[PDB]
Amino acid sequence: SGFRKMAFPSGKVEGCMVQVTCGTTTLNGLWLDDTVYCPRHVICTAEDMLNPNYEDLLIRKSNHSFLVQAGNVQLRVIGHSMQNCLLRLKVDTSNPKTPKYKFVRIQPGQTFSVLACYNGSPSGVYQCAMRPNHTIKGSFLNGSCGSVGFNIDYDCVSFCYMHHMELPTGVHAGTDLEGKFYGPFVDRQTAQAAGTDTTITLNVLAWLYAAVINGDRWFLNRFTTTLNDFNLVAMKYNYEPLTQDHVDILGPLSAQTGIAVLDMCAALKELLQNGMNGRTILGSTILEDEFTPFDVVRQCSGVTFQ
């Protein structure tokens, strides 16, 4: 019993983390086969930040200028190119710890695990969700750029995030593994700020299902509601509008429990309007929104990874 937010075991990704250094600038890189991926702003120095001409700064870069280190091992760089906001460094050695993997671009609301890294050294791992406003509420300090977010499915690592920068509210933005930012941000120290954010309704609902599967069900009721009627209350409380697509994604959980999604929405409606009245749900006093429907299945079903 018990419900924790959990990250994926991080070993498969740990073996891929390296240190990349251009002059005074060091940050993290991801080494898969014979390629190291890293934020392109590694070719900067403390001024080139305001507005770099990446295409042009990269021109004056030599292979020997990139210092790539894996543990106590310097990797000889034999190629380099840019792909959107990432650098792609070719090295003379294929990573022997390279896992089965793929690059995916996750959707807002979806979760992944982040391996926080510094100087090529993994420091910590935690679970987070891509917020509706295309940021993540992470924990990052100087030198953490290049750290990656990922999911694991069976024995396959899906990399979905690489860290680039911290916005003024202390939330974080980055790219997928093709170098394309999530949200409207760009990799320069210009004035940018995250847009207003909303609660991930789909995940709250999922979590509510998890509560029921775990025997926590005092909140259920005998009523239902229309989708539109739910969204009218939901949006007053700054919840993402719920869509029919979301309803279908809750399909398996609704089947397992025999509670129709709209029936659960009425329970959530009542919860928002009346509060909890001192009671708790899966031990919490708030409505958790960083567990996805899939997270719930995987956990309550005891899924493991090879």
Q: Which residues bind a copy of itself (CB under 8 A)?
A: 1-12, 14-15, 71, 115-119, 121-126, 128, 137-141, 143, 166, 170-172, 214-215, 283, 285-286, 298-299, 301-306
Q: Comparing C-alpha atoms, which of 109, 160, 122, 168 is closest to residue 28?
A: 122
The 3-state DSSP class for residue 46 equals: coil
150 binds, among another protein, a copy of itself, none (CB under 5 to 8 A by kind): none
Exposure of 200 in the CB half-sphere (CA atoms within 13 A): 26
Shortest spacing between CB 29 and another protein, in angstroms: 14
20 binds, among a copy of itself, another protein, none (CB under 5 to 8 A by kind): none
State yes or no: residue 188 binds another protein (CB under 8 A): yes
State yes or no: residue 191 binds another protein (CB under 8 A): yes
Q: Which is nearer to another protein, 168 or 215 (CB)?
A: 168
Out of 143, 183, 241, 252, name the contact with another protein by CB under 8 A.
Answer: 143
CB 114 within 8 A of CB 122: no
Out of 20, 43, 44, 148, name the contact with another protein by CB under 8 A.
Answer: 44
> Residue type at 29?
G
Structure tokens that stand for 127 in this block: 């679970």
CA-angle at 239, arms to 234 and 244, nearest 5°: 75
Q: Which is nearer to a copy of itself, 190 or 285 (CB)?
A: 285
- Residue positions counted in the chain: 306
Q: Which of 145, 172, 246, 265 is catalytic?
A: 145
The interface region with another protein, picked from 29-37, 39-47, 153-161, 282-290 by CB under 8 A, is 39-47
State yes or no: residue 39 binds another protein (CB under 8 A): yes
Shortest spacing between CB 290 and a copy of itself, in angstroms: 11
Strand partners, 74: 69
Using the 8-state DSSP alphabet, how is residue 240 labeled? P
Out of 141, 222, 286, 301, name the contact with another protein by CB under 8 A.
Answer: 141
172 annotated active-site: no
CB 241 within 8 A of CB 277: no
Residues 242 and 222: their CA atoms lie apart, in Å, by 21
Shortest spacing between CB 176 and a copy of itself, in angstroms: 21
Out of 167, 220, 227, 300, name the contact with another protein by CB under 8 A.
Answer: 167
Strand partners, 157: 101, 152
State yes or no: residue 73 binds another protein (CB under 8 A): no
Residues 9 and 42: their CA atoms lie apart, in Å, by 28
Q: Which is nearer to a copy of itself, 6 or 49 (CB)?
A: 6
16 annotated active-site: no
Q: Which of 16, 38, 41, 85 is catalytic?
A: 41
CA-angle at 296, arms to 4 and 209, nearest 5°: 105
Residues 164 and 20: their CA atoms lie apart, in Å, by 14
Q: Which residues of 157-172 are buried (b: 16+ CB within 10 A; e: fewer)?
A: bbbbbbbbbbeeeebb
Out of 16, 30, 117, 165, name the contact with another protein by CB under 8 A.
Answer: 165
Out of 51, 65, 190, 238, name the contact with another protein by CB under 8 A.
Answer: 190
**Could you list the active site residues?**
41, 145
